[PDB]
Design an enzyme around this catalytic site. Structure first.
Site, short mmCIF file in Angstrom:
data_model
loop_
_atom_site.label_atom_id
_atom_site.label_comp_id
_atom_site.label_asym_id
_atom_site.label_seq_id
_atom_site.Cartn_x
_atom_site.Cartn_y
_atom_site.Cartn_z
N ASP A 150 0.88 -1.15 0.00
CA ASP A 150 0.00 0.00 0.00
C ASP A 150 0.93 1.21 0.00
O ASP A 150 2.05 1.13 0.50
CB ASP A 150 -0.88 -0.02 1.26
N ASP A 192 0.33 4.92 1.09
CA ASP A 192 0.29 5.68 2.33
C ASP A 192 0.33 4.78 3.56
O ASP A 192 -0.51 3.89 3.72
CB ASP A 192 -0.97 6.55 2.37
N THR A 234 -3.00 1.31 -4.05
CA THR A 234 -3.34 2.46 -3.22
C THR A 234 -4.55 3.24 -3.70
O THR A 234 -4.84 3.31 -4.89
CB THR A 234 -2.16 3.45 -3.15
N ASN A 235 -5.26 3.83 -2.74
CA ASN A 235 -6.44 4.63 -3.01
C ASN A 235 -5.98 6.08 -3.11
O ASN A 235 -6.02 6.82 -2.13
CB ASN A 235 -7.47 4.49 -1.89
N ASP A 292 -1.85 -0.80 6.20
CA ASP A 292 -1.94 -0.36 7.59
C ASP A 292 -3.38 -0.36 8.09
O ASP A 292 -3.62 -0.29 9.29
CB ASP A 292 -1.31 1.03 7.73
N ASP A 316 39.08 9.33 -15.92
CA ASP A 316 40.16 8.84 -16.77
C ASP A 316 40.37 9.87 -17.87
O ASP A 316 40.55 11.06 -17.59
CB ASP A 316 39.77 7.48 -17.37
N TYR A 331 52.69 1.07 -20.41
CA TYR A 331 51.64 0.60 -21.31
C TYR A 331 51.25 1.64 -22.37
O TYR A 331 50.84 1.27 -23.47
CB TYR A 331 50.40 0.22 -20.49
N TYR A 371 45.24 8.15 -27.19
CA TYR A 371 46.62 8.12 -26.69
C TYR A 371 47.61 8.52 -27.77
O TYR A 371 48.74 8.91 -27.48
CB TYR A 371 46.99 6.71 -26.25
N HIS A 401 40.73 1.86 -9.75
CA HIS A 401 40.75 2.80 -10.86
C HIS A 401 39.35 3.03 -11.43
O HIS A 401 39.00 4.14 -11.82
CB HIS A 401 41.66 2.29 -11.96
O1 LIG Z 1 44.75 -0.34 -12.50
C1 LIG Z 1 44.77 -1.08 -13.46
O2 LIG Z 1 44.98 -2.41 -13.32
C2 LIG Z 1 44.57 -0.70 -14.93
C3 LIG Z 1 44.32 0.80 -15.14
C4 LIG Z 1 44.13 1.16 -16.62
C5 LIG Z 1 43.90 2.67 -16.79
C6 LIG Z 1 43.70 3.09 -18.25
N1 LIG Z 1 43.49 4.54 -18.29
C7 LIG Z 1 44.41 5.42 -18.84
O3 LIG Z 1 45.45 5.05 -19.34
N2 LIG Z 1 44.06 6.76 -18.75
C8 LIG Z 1 45.00 7.86 -19.05
C9 LIG Z 1 44.21 9.18 -19.30
C10 LIG Z 1 45.17 10.36 -19.60
C11 LIG Z 1 46.23 10.55 -18.48
C12 LIG Z 1 46.98 9.23 -18.16
C13 LIG Z 1 46.00 8.07 -17.87
MG LIG Z 2 -2.96 3.03 3.76
#
Ligand SMILES: O=C(O)CCCCCNC(=O)NC1CCCCC1
Ligand SMILES: [Mg+2]
Ligand SMILES: O=C(O)CCCCCNC(=O)NC1CCCCC1
Ligand SMILES: [Mg+2]
EC number: 3.3.2.10
Lengths: 547, 547
Positions: A8, A10, A122-123, A184, A334, A382, A465, A523
């Site tokens: 219900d 209310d 409900t009413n 209720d 990010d 990376y 990137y 992250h």
């Molecule tokens: O923690 C982990 O295991 C993997 C994290 C992977 C993050 C990837 N993000 C990234 O590279 N962003 C840039 C954006 C621009 C500035 C530098 C970072």
């Molecule tokens: Mg009621």
């Protein structure tokens, strides 16, 4: 045996009960016990309040009819009424004073989650008061959590009329026995039992829940704090804007008010905000979760130049233009966070406020080049692996399911070592072929990402990137500026690629910068600590954005 | 010979000129003539204001640097400054006091319309003031009217630096000679001439326009009142919401603020609001031009029941739900108007305000049936012709181009006699095979409708008429209610199917109903009298909606 739960409105899913104001107003005014209650139910079946409950007449029409019954109920009781006695004034406060009984709603949600068909019986009445919106928002937040919502003034029937109950069974496509009815009011319960279905007289919540927790055999009371509402793709409004002849950006829109643009990072999608989109909206904002150029339903051209910050920002501005938005609050993460910082540095006029998650704003070094600066950081190794076109794409697009299951992980369940990526000659070189299942995402949530990246792949994203030099040069133009608009920097403790210390100086360029931090947070902030994030952003939004 | 026109922002496309405040502030404060102007341009090329003009530093950073130069310019001039002398306070008023020089903008638009490449060349700055949005909106409204917009602080260059002019020519992909440069500052003009291109010193608008009207050989001054901005499809944000498993509604969204839902009639599309979508947005609203179920990019299921008012409204509510909107201002037309009236009668809680164009709200007669009531009206004859499934579709879908060119016509250029439609056995029985071109729509505008209806055809739309009995019954449930929320009824003088007199009683059911009327206006209001309509709606919106 049970398979359905009916709550219900209310008194059960919302408190304080609007019906309860009658008594309080009496004592407060020292009126004959019941004087107001009587005038309220004067005429039984063929009464004004009943008509109002069946949609025969709007609430604004009822109020006058209710006033007169008080001028007669007090007349027969040999009593009068204060000179500042207003029925509208009384229900106005009473209605706006009614909030969602959170613990009850949670119990309902729990049931549904464990295979239960929920519904509200409900009413109610057709609210056309100058404050109708208030009640509107309430039901708007409750609707989305229940399979059904049967309103008295809607179906033309009202409890305890045995008919509406039949309607319920029919709507629930279930037999009485497998149904639980909470209310209720006792009167509204008898009928339920006369048809079979189990009932529960709801006085105090915890007690009712105990009876419920029992009769249902499912832990409802004293249960862990649940995750915030996670929006469902197919139930979201999808928008598209052509920023350039061959570039069309996609976004998910929900809510009304100040426009809040969410920009995800690599390699995600608008879905990475599934936990904040609802919350922020409910907070009073118009969330515009983006699908950053190169991802999902957004154009993903091959040309690398097509992904340098300058162009990315110009399109975001064009995005605002095409939508008819003069400003917007940009919240990133990010790469997204990176994007918003430069949105503030190059288009302040357009940024209502800017907020970054994890990504710190670091002004480019006029001397050292990006390539050099990056090689200076082991963990950024990376990033060098992403330069050569094709290489990165190959490994990542090879097994989408694995790729995402290996990336989206908590800080205590990692399986990828960004350490010697180049060394090992791959991002997954020594990762399992079938990683476990991160406590952050379900099997489903993951497959959503899989199907998205199945469209444009990882080329477009990876290009973000591949414009270091350009991005660098462009930024050098702002070395003389300063972020002087509402800014908020949220840092993640357990983020080992974007360490909190990388922002320790931000205040030098952003004087009035406010901050936020999240203990034991990886992250992938939104997924890892969604509750903290909403709390933090909503807080910041009301204090520095709404204004 | 000419092919391009470049307008300066301050002093030309916008007034009063922000640069002009310096002098006024002086006299107003009885300061040494130029005291403020000097401190403003102290340092020439390598000056603070120049840096600020090249995007080297934000405006908020400049203000402090400008203050000091006044503390020294007044120091050398052996004078002081009032205790309540604030540079920010002075520019704030000055900037917000600057409005678009309408007649100039119009002249620019005219040029562009007659095959001219327009563009804005101005020495602006990155505005990061707490009132930056103001300037934001200004440029937002100007942008959309010019092919280009070159900002000094953007390109890192500033007039009269001969370089930026080269940039201009290059951007305009045109040689000097075929370019016209308008500016109020002489210095900024010389360079233009030194490169060739024709210049015009702009003091008073009319004078400048005369020189322009001449040098261009195109009537610009003393020209007819032009039509309001008509949005371009490909430049609109397109949204989609799934209201039901197999029903997806499409809409065009533009603007921010109170949500205004526009519901077109039979047989149109969201495009029928092309004249109000921009205007309303610019008025401070979030326009959501709809694509009513059965039309354009909206699902168009065959089932007739799928188009009865009740279902149509429930989906509109679901539409609000999916979008996260508690309320919304519903403005309809033709069938649309019908839809909004019942949105107010059944979901007041959801309607911020309701407004109908042409369509009057007439409560169903409990006694007489729709079929009977309709046959009682000669002009509604055609409605009987729409009953039988297929018949109507055949004739209408036969020649889309003709169909629309025959329908969309002014009240003085009709070619269809809804009189004896059934008699003649067709809607076009005696209409030309190639009607002329209505002064309301261009050849293009028409083809847009043609391509839309090419998708789902006329079946879905025609179904809106095939639910009389159901719609009737449903409505009888509200005979006891009353529209007590902000309502506005706009009547069309020359509408011969929806005569203004059909609403003469509306006030009986809608007590506080406001009204509007449009002289010599046909049935297709938006197209026929777009200016009056905007004026009327915007007026009503600010007084009863924004609240
Ligand atoms: O923690 C982990 O295991 C993997 C994290 C992977 C993050 C990837 N993000 C990234 O590279 N962003 C840039 C954006 C621009 C500035 C530098 C970072
Ligand atoms: Mg009621
Ligand atoms: O003027 C002309 O030459 C042609 C006018 C054609 C009007 C078509 N609109 C219509 O039938 N609307 C219904 C909506 C529901 C109420 C009755 C009218
Ligand atoms: Mg000027």
């Amino acid at each position: 045996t049970l398979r359905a739960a009916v709550f219900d409105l209310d008194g059960v899913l919302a408190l304080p009960a609007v019906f309860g104001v009658l008594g309080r107003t009496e004592e407060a005014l020292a009126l004959p016990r019941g004087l107001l209650n009587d005038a309220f139910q004067k005429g039984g079946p063929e009464g004004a309040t009943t008509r109002l409950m069946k949609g025969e007449i709007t609430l604004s029409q009822w109020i006058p009819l209710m006033e007169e019954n008080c001028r007669k109920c007090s007349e027969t009781a040999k009593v009068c009424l204060p000179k500042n006695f207003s029925i509208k004034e009384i229900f106005d406060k009473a209605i706006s004073a009614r909030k969602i009984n959170r613990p009850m709603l949670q119990a309902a949600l729990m049931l549904r989650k464990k295979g239960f068909t929920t519904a509200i019986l409900t009413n109610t009445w057709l609210d056309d008061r100058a404050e109708r919106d208030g009640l509107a928002q309430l039901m708007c937040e409750l609707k989305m959590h229940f399979d059904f919502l049967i309103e008295s003034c809607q179906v033309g029937m009202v409890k305890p009329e045995p008919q509406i109950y039949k309607f319920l069974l029919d709507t629930l496509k279930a037999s009485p026995s497998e149904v639980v009815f909470l209310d209720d009011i006792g009167a509204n319960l008898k009928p339920a039992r006369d048809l079979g279905m189990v009932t529960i007289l709801v006085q105090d919540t915890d007690t009712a829940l105990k009876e419920l927790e029992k009769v249902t055999g499912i832990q409802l009371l004293n249960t862990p704090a649940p995750l915030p509402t996670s929006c469902n793709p197919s139930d979201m409004s999808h928008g598209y804007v052509t920023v350039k002849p061959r570039v069309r950006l996609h976004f998910v829109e929900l809510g009304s008010g100040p426009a809040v643009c969410l920009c995800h990072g690599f390699p995600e999608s608008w879905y990475s905000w599934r936990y904040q989109i609802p919350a922020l909206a409910q907070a009073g904002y118009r969330v515009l979760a983006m699908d950053m150029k190169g991802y999902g339903e957004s154009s993903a051209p091959p040309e690398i130049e097509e992904y340098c910050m300058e162009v990315l920002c110009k399109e975001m501005v064009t995005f605002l233009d095409k939508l008819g938005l003069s400003q917007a609050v940009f919240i990133g993460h990010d790469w997204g966070g990176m994007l918003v910082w430069y949105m503030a540095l190059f288009y302040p006029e357009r940024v209502r406020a800017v907020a970054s998650l994890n990504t710190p704003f670091i002004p480019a070094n006029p001397n050292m080049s990006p390539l050099e600066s990056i090689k200076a950081n082991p963990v950024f190794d990376y990033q060098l692996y992403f330069q050569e076109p094709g290489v990165a794409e190959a490994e990542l697009e090879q097994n989408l399911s694995r790729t995402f299951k290996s990336l989206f992980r908590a800080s205590d369940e990692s399986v990828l070592s960004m350490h010697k990526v180049c060394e090992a000659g791959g991002l997954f070189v020594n990762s399992p072929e079938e990683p476990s299942l991160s406590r952050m995402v379900t099997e489903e949530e993951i497959q959503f990402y899989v199907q998205q990246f199945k469209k444009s792949g990882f080329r477009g994203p990876l290009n973000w990137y591949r414009n270091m030099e350009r991005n660098w040069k462009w930024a050098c133009k702002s070395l003389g500026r300063k972020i002087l608009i509402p800014a908020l920097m949220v840092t993640a403790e357990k983020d080992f690629v974007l360490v909190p210390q990388m922002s320790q100086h931000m205040e030098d360029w952003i004087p009035h910068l406010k901050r936020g931090h999240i203990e034991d947070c990886g992250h992938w902030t939104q997924m890892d600590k969604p509750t903290e994030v909403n709390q933090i952003l909503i807080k910041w939004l009301d204090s520095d954005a709404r204004n």
